[PDB]
Amino acid sequence: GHMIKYYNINGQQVPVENATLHVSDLSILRGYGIFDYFLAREGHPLFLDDYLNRFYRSAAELYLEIPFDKAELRRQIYALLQANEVREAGIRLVLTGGYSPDGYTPVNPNLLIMMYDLPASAWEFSAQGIKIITHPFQRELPEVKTINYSTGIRMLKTIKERGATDLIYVDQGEWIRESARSNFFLVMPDNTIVTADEKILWGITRRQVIDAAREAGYAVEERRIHITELDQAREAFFTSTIKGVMAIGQIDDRVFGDGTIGKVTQELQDLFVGKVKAYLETC
Amino acid sequence: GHMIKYYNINGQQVPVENATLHVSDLSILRGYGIFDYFLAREGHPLFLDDYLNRFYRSAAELYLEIPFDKAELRRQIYALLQANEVREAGIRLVLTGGYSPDGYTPVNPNLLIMMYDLPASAWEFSAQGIKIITHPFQRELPEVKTINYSTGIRMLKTIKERGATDLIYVDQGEWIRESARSNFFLVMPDNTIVTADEKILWGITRRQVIDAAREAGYAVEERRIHITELDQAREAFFTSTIKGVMAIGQIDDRVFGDGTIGKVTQELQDLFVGKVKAYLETC
Ligand SMILES: Cc1ncc(COP(=O)(O)O)c(C/N=C2/CONC2=O)c1O
Ligand SMILES: Cc1ncc(COP(=O)(O)O)c(C/N=C2/CONC2=O)c1O
What we know:
homodimer; 27% helix; six-stranded antiparallel beta sheet; binds the ligand Cc1ncc(COP(=O)(O)O)c(C/N=C2/CONC2=O)c1O; 2 domains; 7 helices; 16 strands
């Protein structure tokens, strides 16, 4: 495991210790930007075309022009894995509103490519379900992967104080959406998989799990989820790039099962790992 | 007018060209931070204690500890005006979530003090009212001056395309709040001044104008404002640090008067200038 030595800023490889932005950048002053994050295994960013299509769609929703095409960004990503001499990594793309003249009006974005060790916790797939709280909130521009995590970060103290390790956002306290950094699923007692269809981020992991579940012949409903449906479900889980599929054992005082991982959630962990293995066989 | 040469980062004076943050800062990655902005005239930041009390209240709502007390921050601000050899300036404080280990969990904040020329447009007080559009939106954590301006910035294209130069947020399209960077007032045909009391930023300029209006013996109602009240008002105006009091001539196709500045709005421009003159007489 070679230590990460380099990032890329605006197409230039830079040592990690010299990777800076001038304080006029609109990410610092105005929180204006998008990002993406994905893993690399065996030298290959996972589901890369899907992440990069999302990154370009996000940038278009903020009217931020990425300074070159998808194939050139992919070349820069691969060049950075080779420069760092790593096969196993986390990769962050950031696209800011740039060095604005007036601290508000965007200009040519700043583009950052950052690289990390593969998170040690990635796809841990604990048999013990996590404990989470509901929080009334709706993410702004939820289909765009903006850099805006204020509410999620501000809630870290309250989450920890209340005895939880994460949250789930409930729009108007009525409609189940997503966590600050994960998509959210239920499994009903008849094995129907349920997840929100609107006003959420369209996770790559969510997409792979829904596809894998539908190919295994599960019923998957993408629909509005009322809060009262937490009392009808057998299982609950999170999806994300780093979690894969993560069992939820308790939401408020609703305990799912004995709190350990449900049968469908564990099957979907194996199916997700199958999607990853299949992708790496195309690389 | 001496050119601004220095900013202050974490209590160190730094040349403008060297004022940077490492890309691990949570403002860049997660949009986590607060700020404040105020003018200086005759060598004196305006209403300074009120801005600094707001800055400390904002920081406490994000659980970000400013690394010293209000009197030490004030000393640093004054030291920077002297270092730049300016009497007339705009001043920006930023407090970020800092260089987070995991790209999410805040740590010791990064504190920035930036300085600018006095905006040339500041307190222009145009007799011609500006043209603005309504936009359905509610700011997150609206009483905190967070760095999150995504929606306001994203809307710049649409504002310009629709023939306007600003917007007004309408919560659920029912309740009048504020613009992205200004508080919003109405004046009714009986001269009652109306402004929202909830789910807005508590502007310093708003506070000075309400106080000045109440001292002049106007009726000032701080209350919920229904969208249909735009058709009942004689005048509309914006308040902010840079606008002072700014006449609004049109909101959608509602034209206020002949579109030129209303009688009460102009009186409040003079009263606001009186509050500034009175403050500078205490310095
Ligand atoms: C708001 C939100 N929803 C859902 C997801 C999951 O999308 P996926 O990773 O499956 O595409 C994330 C990404 N979560 C993280 C975790 O920290 N870095 C990220 O990018 C997210 O930030
Ligand atoms: C959301 C919002 N509401 C109201 C105001 C007005 O508050 P005041 O300046 O009267 O305290 C601002 C500040 N507006 C700007 C304009 O750009 N820089 C700022 O700080 C603001 O950002």
